[PDB]
């Protein structure tokens, strides 16, 4: 069932997401900087609705414990960049409406792992984040 899947996700968040975000809060207070939550997403969900629910939980969890300003979702996609960009737009629409914060969803294909393409996507992500923080 999907419920048991979400129960295992909630156990994972308390064991892994919470420790990392507790660290982020301390770093954010030493430096006086807001927190952006970066989520890598496995391509193993049976449906986009379960994916959306799981991501909503992870983001709402991060809002609860670390008052995050934005979330960047890296959606692994086993296919073309064109399909990946369409799937990212669908997910981004769901998460923006559901979580109430700025969400950037990026589709990532295996070919994007080239160090030169990593630099491209990084540049694009940081520029979008700079608009949310200063523009």
């Amino acid at each position: 069932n999907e419920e048991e899947a979400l129960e295992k996700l909630k156990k994972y968040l308390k064991e892994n997401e919470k420790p990392k975000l507790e660290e982020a809060k301390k770093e954010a207070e030493e430096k006086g900087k807001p927190i952006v939550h970066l989520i890598t997403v496995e391509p193993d969900f049976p449906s986009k609705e379960l994916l959306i629910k799981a991501l909503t939980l992870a983001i709402k969890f991060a809002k609860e414990i670390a008052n995050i300003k934005a979330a960047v979702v890296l959606l692994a996609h086993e296919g073309s960049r064109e399909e990946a960009e369409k799937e990212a737009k669908e997910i981004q629409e769901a998460l923006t409406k559901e979580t109430g914060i700025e969400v950037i969803v990026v589709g990532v294909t295996p070919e994007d792992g080239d160090e030169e393409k990593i630099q491209e996507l990084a540049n694009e992500i940081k520029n979008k984040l700079s608009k949310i923080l200063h523009g």
Partner: protein
């Protein structure tokens, strides 16, 4: 090169974290899987 899309997202997230020490936000990386069949 990466053989899977999960390799690529991991490399991307690692680069973003390890290149943004002087960036205007704290970046915190976490992973979400389906936990299903």
């Amino acid at each position: 090169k990466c053989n899977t899309a999960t390799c690529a997202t991991q490399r991307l997230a690692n680069f973003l974290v390890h290149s943004s020490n002087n960036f205007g936000a704290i970046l915190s990386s976490t992973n979400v899987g389906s936990n299903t069949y």
